[PDB]
Amino acid sequence: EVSQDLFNQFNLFAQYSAAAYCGKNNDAPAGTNITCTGNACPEVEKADATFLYSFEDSGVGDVTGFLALDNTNKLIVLSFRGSRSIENWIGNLNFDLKEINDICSGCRGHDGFTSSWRSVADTLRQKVEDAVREHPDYRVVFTGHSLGGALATVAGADLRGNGYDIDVFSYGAPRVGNRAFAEFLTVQTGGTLYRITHTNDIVPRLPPREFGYSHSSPEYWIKSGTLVPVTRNDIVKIEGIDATGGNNQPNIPDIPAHLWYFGLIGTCL
Amino acid sequence: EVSQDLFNQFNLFAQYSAAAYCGKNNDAPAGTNITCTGNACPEVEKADATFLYSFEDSGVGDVTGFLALDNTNKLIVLSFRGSRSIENWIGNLNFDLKEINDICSGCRGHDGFTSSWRSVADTLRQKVEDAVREHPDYRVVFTGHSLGGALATVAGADLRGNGYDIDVFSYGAPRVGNRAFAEFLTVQTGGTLYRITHTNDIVPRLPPREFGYSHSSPEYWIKSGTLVPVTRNDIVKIEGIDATGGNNQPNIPDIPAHLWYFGLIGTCL
Amino acid sequence: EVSQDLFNQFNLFAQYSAAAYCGKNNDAPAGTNITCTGNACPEVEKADATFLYSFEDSGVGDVTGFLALDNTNKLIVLSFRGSRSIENWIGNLNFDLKEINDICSGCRGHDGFTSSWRSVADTLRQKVEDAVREHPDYRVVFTGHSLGGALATVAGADLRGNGYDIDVFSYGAPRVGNRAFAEFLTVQTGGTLYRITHTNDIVPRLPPREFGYSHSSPEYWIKSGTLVPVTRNDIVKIEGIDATGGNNQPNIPDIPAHLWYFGLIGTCL
Ligand SMILES: *C(=O)CCC[C@H](CCC)[C@H](CCCCCCCCCCCCCC)CCCCCCCCCC(=O)OC[C@@H](O)COC(=O)CCCCCCCCCCCCCCCCC
Ligand SMILES: *[C@@H]1O[C@H](CO)[C@@H](O)[C@H](O)[C@H]1NC(C)=O
Ligand SMILES: *C(=O)CCCCCCC
Ligand SMILES: [Ca+2]
Ligand SMILES: [Ca+2]
Ligand SMILES: [Ca+2]
C-alpha cells in the first residue's frame, strides 16, 4: 500500500511518460498545449501544461521526448520516450558497462543509456535550469517508461546537486548500471527516485544480473493485473538492493505487463 | 473436409492476401497488372487482375493494401496488408476494447484495428462503391492475412447492408472484439465471413480470452503442417462461438505456422 | 583449441563483420579509411584498410556491406552486414528451400539468402575481380555476422573456382540450405569455410532441421561465455554434417550469445 498522494503522483507521471510516445509531442512548437491520442494522458490534458522544448532524433540513440511546464501542478517535467525506433533498439543492445566516475566513484552504466544522455545533457541541462530560474517555486521531475525511465534515472543522477531537487519516476525501467551505481541511486540526496514496476514485466529484469547489473532500492511493485485499474492498495514498496519478491522473481516474464502501468504506455502513435 | 470449390476460393484469396505485402502492390498505377515475387501469388497473376486503387501509410496505423479488378473471376477484391511496419505493430498493441456501437449494438472492438479502419473508411467505401457501380455483377470480397484479416473483418461488418454482398476471407486473423461483436460477425446478413486458421498459429489466439475477446463462428482450420501443401481434406469446419478443438486449443503455440496458409504469406518484399 | 594464427584471423574478420553494421561504412567514399565507433573494430583501424566499394539498400532484401582493401594484411575483404532493417528481417523469414542447380545438383538453399545474393552477384563479382586484377598478390575473404555470414557463405560457393581462392568466415550464421548443399559446402575446394558459432546462440539453430536444413562441416565453437574474452583454447573444432555437441545441442537457446563473437557485434550505429 501507498498513500493516496503518492498514488496520484504515480498516475500523473505515468501519463507524462505515455505522452512522450505520441509523435505529435516530439516536434511541437514551444508554448502549445500538451495533448495525447485517446485517453493516453487525460490528467496531463486537464492541466495547464505546455511545451518548453519538444525534441526527436536527438543525440545518439534517437533521444526523444519533451520538456513541459505544468502551471496547474507547478512542475517542470522532463519526459523521455521509450523504445520505438530501430535506432532506439540498437542503443539498448550496447549493454556493455562504461565508466561514469564523473557521476559517482567506481560506478559503471549501460553504454547506450549513458551515451544517449551524454549526447544531449548540455542542451537539456540548460533548458531545465532556465526553467528553474524563472519558476523557483516549481518542482523538477524527470520521468520515462522503459528506456525513457532509464534515461530519466541517469539524467537525474547526473544533474542533481546543483541547488534544486530532481525527482525521478521511472516505469518498467531496465537496470542501468553496476552495484556501485545502484547503491548511489539508493542513497543519493537532492531528490527521490521512484522506480515503479508491474507484476512480471520482463524489462526490469534486463539486463540480467549475470552481466554485472543491479537495481537501486526501493522498488514500487504494482501487483494488479494487466488492464486492471490500479488502487493504492495494489502497490507494494520493496526495499533492498536487488531485492526479490517484487518484479525480480524467478518466474515466467510477460510482455503485455510491460504496457500496463496504470494505463496503456508505449502505444500512443 | 471442404468442397473443391471452397478450397479454390480459400487458395485464391490467400494469394490476394499474400500479394498485399509486396511493396510494388502498394503504390501502383491504376489499370496495371497485379504481380508478386517468387511464386507468392501465381493464381492472381494468371488472372486478369489489375489495380483499381493502391494505398500505403494511409490513415492511422499505416493502413496498406490494394483494391483489385479481377475480370477472370468477376471479383472486386479489397486486400489489406498485415503487419510489417513499426506503425503496424504499435497499432496491434492498442488492445483495449473500444465501443463500435455504430457497427453493431453492444459491440466493442480492438482499439487499434477499429481506429485504423475508421481512419480510412470513407475513402475506401467510395472506392469500393465506385467499382460496384462500374461492375454491378462482380462479387465484392475483402481479404487479408493477420492484421489484414482483422481490418477486412471490421471493414466488411461496417460496410455491409448498403445494397451489395461483401464476403470476407481472413487468414490467421486475431480476435477483433468482445462476444457481442463475435456474435454479430457470426450472424450478419449481406455476405459471409470465412475465418481461416492454421494448426497452432499463435495469432488467432490473440488477444487472449482473458482480455475480453471472442472469436466469431465458424472456423475453418487447416490441419496440415508448415511447409506442407494443403488439400481440401486437410480443412475442417468448426462451429460455435469461441469453439475449441481447432486453432483454439490449450497447447503450445507456434510462430512459423502463422506464415504458412496454403503458401508463404507475409514474406513478399 | 585452434592455433594462435587462426585465432588472430577469427578475431580480425569478426571485426570486419562488426564494421559492416556501422552506418557510415555503407555509404563511404571509395579510398577512405574504414573506421568504427565504440571500439567495434580496433584491429581493422590499425590496418591500412580502405573502401573499394560501399553499398546499402542493394538488390532485394537490403543487401548492405562493403568491399575493403587491406594493405597491411594483404586482403581483399567482402563484408556483408547482418540484420538491421525491417527488409532484412523479412528476407530472413523467406525460409522455403529453392533449387540452386547452378551451384550443385540436388542442392537447395534458403530462398531469401539466395535471392538476395543473386540480385547483387553480377555487380559484386565484378568489383571483387577488378580488385584481384589490381592486387593479384592479395587474398580474397568473404565475411559476415548472422545474415551477413549466410550471404558470405552463399557468395563464396557461387564465385569459387574462377582462379582465385575465396575463404569465408561466418559468425553466428544460420543454416543456409538442405543436406546436399551442406555436403557441397563441406567438400568444395577453391577456398576454406570457417563457420564460427558461440555457445547456445539461437541463430545457428535456425531454420530448424525439421524444415529440411542442415549445417556444413566443420564447426568452430566458442565455449567462452557472453562478455567473456575469447582465447584460442576456448574454440573447439567439431567435424560432421549436422554434428551435435557444439552449438547444435538440445538445450535452451540464448539471444545475447548471438551478439558476442570476440566482442559486441551487430551493435555499431
Ligand atoms: C522500452 O524499451 C519501450 C518498449 C515499449 C515499446 C513501445 C510500445 C509499442 C515496444 C515495441 C517497440 C518496437 C520494437 C521493435 C523491435 C522489438 C523486437 C522484439 C520485441 C518483442 C516482440 C515479442 C518477441 C514494446 C515491445 C517491446 C517488448 C520487449 C521489450 C524488450 C526490452 C526493451 C529494452 O529496453 O531492452 C533492454 C535492454 O537492456 C536489452 O537487454 C538485453 O540484454 C537484450 C535482451 C534481448 C531479449 C532477451 C530474451 C529474454 C531472456 C529471457 C528469456 C525468456 C524465458 C523466461 C522463462 C524462464 C522460466 C523457466
Ligand atoms: C587513412 O589511413 C591511411 C594510412 O593507413 C592514410 O591515408 C591516412 O592517414 C588516413 N586518412 C584519413 C582521411 O584519415
Ligand atoms: C542476423 O540476422 C543477426 C542479427 C544481428 C544482431 C544485431 C545486434 C543485436
Ligand atoms: Ca491543457
Ligand atoms: Ca495477370
Ligand atoms: Ca587505418
CA A82 – CA A94 distance, rounded (Å):
16
DSSP-derived secondary structure letter, C22: S
User: Using CA positions, which residue lies closest to atom 36 of ligand 1?
Assistant: A92
List the single residue in A38, A85, A267 with the smallest CB-CB distance to B93: A267
According to DSSP, the residues that pair with B33 across neighbouring strands are B50
Q: Is A145 on the interface with B (CB under 8 A)?
A: no
List the single residue in A84, A226, A259 with the smallest CB-CB distance to B86: A84
> Which of B57, B90, B267, B268 best tests the C interface by mutation, with the highest count of C CBs <10 A?
B267
Active-site pick, A62, A158, A167, A201: A201
Experimental method: X-ray
Q: Which atom of ligand 3 is nearest to the CA of A93?
A: 9
CA B169 to ligand 5 centroid distance, Å: 21
How distant is the Cα of C201 from the closest Cα of chain A, in angstroms?
A: 16
**Number of domains composing chain C:** 1
User: Cβ–Cβ of A264/B94 closer than 8 Å?
Assistant: yes
Strand order in the sheet with A235-238: A49-58, A63-70, A75-80, A139-145, A166-171, A193-198, A219-222, A235-238
| Ligand that lies nearest to the alpha carbon of residue A48, given by its number in the listed order | 4
CB-proximal residues (5 Å) to ion ligand 4: A 33
> Omega of the bond prior to C207 within 30 degrees of 0, cis?
yes
User: Cβ–Cβ of B38/C86 closer than 8 Å?
Assistant: no
Q: Any idea what the Cα angle at residue A106 is, between residues A105 and A112, rounded to 5°?
A: 105
Cell of A152: 530519466
Nearest to A168 by CA among A153, A148, A179: A153
User: Using CA positions, which residue lies closest to atom 30 of ligand 1?
Assistant: A203
Q: CB-based contacts of C190: which residues, under 8 Å, 6+ apart?
A: C160, C161, C165, C166
How distant is the Cα of B94 from the closest Cα of chain A, in angstroms?
A: 6
CA C13 – CA C21 distance, rounded (Å):
13
Q: Is C266 on the interface with A (CB under 8 A)?
A: yes
Q: Is C96 on the interface with B (CB under 8 A)?
A: yes
CA A76 – CA B71 distance, rounded (Å):
63
How distant, in Å, are the alpha carbons of B97, C18, C125, C159 from that of C122? 53, 25, 5, 10
User: Cβ–Cβ of C38/A86 closer than 8 Å?
Assistant: no
Q: Is A33 on the interface with C (CB under 8 A)?
A: no
Residue of B nearest to A263 (CA): B96
Domain that holds residue B97: 1-269
CA C148 – CA C17 distance, rounded (Å):
8
CA B75 to ligand 5 centroid distance, Å: 14
Q: CB-based contacts of A40: which residues, under 8 Å, 6+ apart?
A: A15, A18, A19, A21, A22, A263, A264, A267, A268
User: Cβ–Cβ of A91/C266 closer than 8 Å?
Assistant: no
Catalytic site residue C102?
no
According to DSSP, the residues that pair with B76 across neighbouring strands are B69, B140
According to DSSP, the residues that pair with B137 across neighbouring strands are none
CA B166 – CA B31 distance, rounded (Å):
23
| Ligand that lies nearest to the alpha carbon of residue A73, given by its number in the listed order | 4
Which H, E and C letters describe chain A, residue by residue? Answer: CCCHHHHHHHHHHHHHHHHCCCHHHCCCCCCCECCCCCCCCHHHHHCCEEEEEEEEEECCCCEEEEEEEECCCCEEEEEECCCCCHHHHHHHHCCCEEECCCCCCCCEEEHHHHHHHHHHHHHHHHHHHHHHHHCCCCEEEEEEECHHHHHHHHHHHHHCCCCCCEEEEEECCCCCECHHHHHHHHHCCCCCEEEEEECCECHHHCCCHHHCCECCCCEEEECCCCCCCCCCCCEEEECCCCCCCCCCCCCCCECHHHHEECEECCCCC
Q: Is B111 on the interface with A (CB under 8 A)?
A: yes
List the single residue in B85, B86, B264 with the smallest CB-CB distance to C94: B264
> Which of A63, A89, A90, A202 best tests the C interface by mutation, with the highest count of C CBs <10 A?
A90
CA B70 to ligand 5 centroid distance, Å: 9
What residues 201-260 of chain C have any CB closer than 8 A to a CB of chain B?
A: 211-212
How distant, in Å, are the alpha carbons of A167, A233, A234, C255 from that of A4? 18, 9, 12, 41
Catalytic site residue B217?
no
Chains B–C, number of C-beta pairs less than 8 Å apart: 28
Per the CB < 8 A criterion, the answer to whether C80 and C144 are in contact is yes
CA A66 – CA A50 distance, rounded (Å):
10
Active-site pick, B17, B201, B214, B217: B201
What is chain B's Cα-based Rg? 17
CA A35 – CA A53 distance, rounded (Å):
15
CA A203 to ligand 1 centroid distance, Å: 6
Neighboring chains of C (3 or more beta-carbon pairs < 8 A): A, B
CA C176 – CA C172 distance, rounded (Å):
12
How distant is the Cα of B93 from the closest Cα of chain A, in angstroms?
A: 6
Q: Is A87 on the interface with C (CB under 8 A)?
A: yes
Q: Residues of A with CB below 8 A from B90's CB?
A: 84, 266-267, 269
Cell of B218: 465458424
- From C201, C226, C265, C269, give the residue whose CB has the most ligand 3 atoms within 8 Å, as the site to mutate: C265
User: Cβ–Cβ of C90/B269 closer than 8 Å?
Assistant: yes
Which H, E and C letters describe C196-263, residue by residue? Answer: EEECCECHHHCCCHHHCCECCCCEEEECCCCCCCCCHHHEEEECCCCCCCCCCCCCCCECHHHHEECE
Per the CB < 8 A criterion, the answer to whether C177 and C110 are in contact is yes
CA A10 – CA A19 distance, rounded (Å):
14
Q: Is B118 on the interface with A (CB under 8 A)?
A: no
Q: Is A86 on the interface with C (CB under 8 A)?
A: yes
Q: CB-based contacts of B109: which residues, under 8 Å, 6+ apart?
A: B97, B98, B100, B103, B154, B176, B177, B178, B181
